[PDB]
Design a protein around this nucleic acid. Sequence first.
DNA 1: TTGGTTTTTCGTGCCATAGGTTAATGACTTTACAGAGGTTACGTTTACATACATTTGTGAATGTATGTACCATGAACGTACCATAATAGAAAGA
Length: 79
Amino acid sequence: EMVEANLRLVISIAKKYTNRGLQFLDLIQEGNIGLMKAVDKFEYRRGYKFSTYATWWIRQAITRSIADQARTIRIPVHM
DNA sequence: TTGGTTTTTCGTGCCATAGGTTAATGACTTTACAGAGGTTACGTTTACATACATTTGTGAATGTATGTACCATGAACGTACCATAATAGAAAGA
């Protein structure tokens, strides 16, 4: 029920990170994986909304996806 | 008067006495082959000192490793020229 009601937050934050690094369906899938990893470690006693906490995780997912291959060769993340 | 048998010399042919170059095996002698004996300058075997390598620990380069807590809620997010005709498909009236 969480993922079927928050796929659209993922696509809304994922359609602004499509700067021609790779085809964007992999970015949609990695955003869904980041949504899963943000739901798996979500707290209730904080009192804040879930989007601000999930934004950092989904940007980390999109960052590691765009820095995973990024070329035909392998370049590390720090480089 | 002329042809032919008979007979005797005479240079030529056969036999015998003399005397010399030159074949014989050898005895040569000279060259060649076969016998040992002292000396040379290597070739193989052996020990010993020092060297490039190769085998170890120790100080620096990167690299995945998990997370960051006001609010972020659907779209292509700029692609593209529009040739030509054999063979089927999903329906529409015959």
